[PDB]
Structures are given as C-alpha cells and as structure tokens.
Design brief:
The structure is cut from a larger assembly and holds two copies of chain A (about 50 residues). Chain A has about 50 residues and is mostly beta strands. Chain A has one helix and two strands; from the N terminus they run βαβ. The two termini of chain A are about 20 Å apart. The interface of A and B includes residues 15, 20, 21 and 29 of A. The PDB classes it as viral protein. The entry lists the keywords coronavirus, SARS-CoV-2, Spike protein, S protein, S antigen, covid-19, receptor binding, membrane fusion, vaccine design, viral protein.
Chain lengths: ~50, ~50
C-alpha cells in the first residue's frame, strides 16, 4: 500500500507504454478524472491469477 | 484486444479519447472478434495505426 501525494496525475504517459486488460472506476466516471483531484490516494499493488 | 473495453460510452483511453469516441446517447451494437490469424504476420503487422 503506497501513499501517493503532492503530485499531478495526468495518466497520459501510461498510454505510450502500458496497455491495461481492465480499468474500472467505482465512484467516479473515467472521463472526469482529468477534471478532479483527490483528498488522499493509496495504491494497493499485488499479483494475482 | 485490451482496448476492446474502450469501445463503449463513458470510457477513456488512447482510443476513446484520440481515435474513436462514442456518444453517451448511443443506440446500436458493438461487435468484436479476434483476428490473430488474419491481421498478424511473422515479423509483425505494422499496417494498423
């Protein structure tokens, strides 16, 4: 669980290299994320089947 | 393949935003199937941009 703070989240950089099998926002719409900022962010990172 | 999910209303990504955007008032059908045995060759197929 990584804490993300004090930064600009563009996510446009990811397009040139990453290709996600799934992307899913609960809560908020995927198209509003550029027009939004967050109170705290945690990134829960793990490998599954 | 991983971009098939992006061909939908409300989605974002390099395709939803840059190359093929759907209306949020869309009536119709999205049909997709793999073409791994047609649109790909050895040395890779670089004709799809």
């Amino acid at each position: 669980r990584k804490r993300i703070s004090n930064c600009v989240a563009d996510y446009s950089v990811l397009y040139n290299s990453a290709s996600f099998s799934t992307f899913k926002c609960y809560g908020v719409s995927p198209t509003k994320l550029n027009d939004l900022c967050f109170t705290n962010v945690y990134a829960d990172s793990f490998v599954i089947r | 393949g991983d971009e098939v999910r992006q061909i939908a209303p409300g989605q974002t990504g390099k395709i939803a935003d840059y190359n093929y955007k759907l209306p949020d008032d869309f009536t119709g059908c999205v049909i997709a199937w793999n073409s791994n045995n047609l649109d790909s060759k050895v040395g890779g197929n670089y004709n799809y941009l």
